[PDB]
Amino acid sequence: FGSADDTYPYLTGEWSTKFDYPPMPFDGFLFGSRVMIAKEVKTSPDAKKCIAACTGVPDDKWEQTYKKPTGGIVTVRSEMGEPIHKIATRGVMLWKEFDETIFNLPKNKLVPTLEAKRDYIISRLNAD
Amino acid sequence: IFFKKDSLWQSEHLEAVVDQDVQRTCILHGPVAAQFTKVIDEPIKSIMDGIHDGHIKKLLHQYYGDDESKIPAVEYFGGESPVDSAVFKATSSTDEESWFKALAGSEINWRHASF
Numbered sequence A: 001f002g003s004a005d006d007t008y009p010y011l012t013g014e015w016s017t018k019f020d021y022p023p024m025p026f027d028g029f030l031f032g033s034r035v036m037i038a039k040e041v042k043t044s045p046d047a048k049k050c051i052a053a054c055t056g057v058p059d060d061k062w063e064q065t066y067k068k069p070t071g072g073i074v075t076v077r078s079e080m081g082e083p084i085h086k087i088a089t090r091g092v093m094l095w096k097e098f099d100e101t102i103f104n105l106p107k108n109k110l111v112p113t114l115e116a117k118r119d120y121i122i123s124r125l126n127a128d
Numbered sequence B: 001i002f003f004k005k006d007s008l009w010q011s012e013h014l015e016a017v018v019d020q021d022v023q024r025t026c027i028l029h030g031p032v033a034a035q036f037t038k039v040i041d042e043p044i045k046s047i048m049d050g051i052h053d054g055h056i057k058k059l060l061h062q063y064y065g066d067d068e069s070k071i072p073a074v075e076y077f078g079g080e081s082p083v084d085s086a087v088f089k090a091t092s093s094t095d096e097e098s099w100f101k102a103l104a105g106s107e108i109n110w111r112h113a114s115f
């Protein structure tokens, strides 16, 4: 959610109608992303600029975050392996690549794969 | 652990990132709410008010015939949990909840809140 407008049908209870269900009204709404640009969040200048310029995507196509960048946003896994929704910056996409290549591997294949990529790994750190 | 450790704080301090390159940085955001996020550096009071205010118009139109006179009113708003002259003598057995509702009054005012 981001505006009063898209949020309204969930207040009327009219949203649930698209699915042939009785009107199903809600009591309130929370806005997480929508506020990240506000004059008073500590989000850095260049970062607010980055956030805006992300084209969104309808609920129609959010599933694609799992694979490609989708509206400028990918999922990426934390150190613990739980999914995280991040802006698809260069660093984040490296993090995603390592997520798929290096961190992916069994703890047995770790140290060998690192050494065979040491030059590459060390380079991509320094760049992105 | 060296890679992913403590990696949320750069979004807010790019002066300490390699060369202030946001493109190196973890920023969190939703794919669907991203489309509604456009107006940079807009005061938070505005964003929130923008939503409430907009809900208020749509609501007025639909169920109030755009007449603000039709909106019922009350002294102060809130304090509701999701669930002319008299004398109350009190005993051991008097229900506390019932008792206060009496002294509270039905009209929402200073005496209602006082009890």
Ligand SMILES: Cc1cc2nc3c(=O)[nH]c(=O)nc-3n(C[C@H](O)[C@H](O)[C@H](O)COP(=O)(O)O)c2cc1C
Binding pocket: A001, A030, A031, A032, A033, A034, B027, B028, B029, B030, B031, B032, B033
């Ligand atoms: C940058 C960022 C940091 C967040 N930190 C927390 C947190 O510390 N605890 C929590 O229960 N939810 C946290 N959330 C989840 C939001 O509070 C909320 O559930 C979600 O952002 C709403 O989705 P939306 O941004 O698409 O409106 C965070 C979301 C974002 C984008």
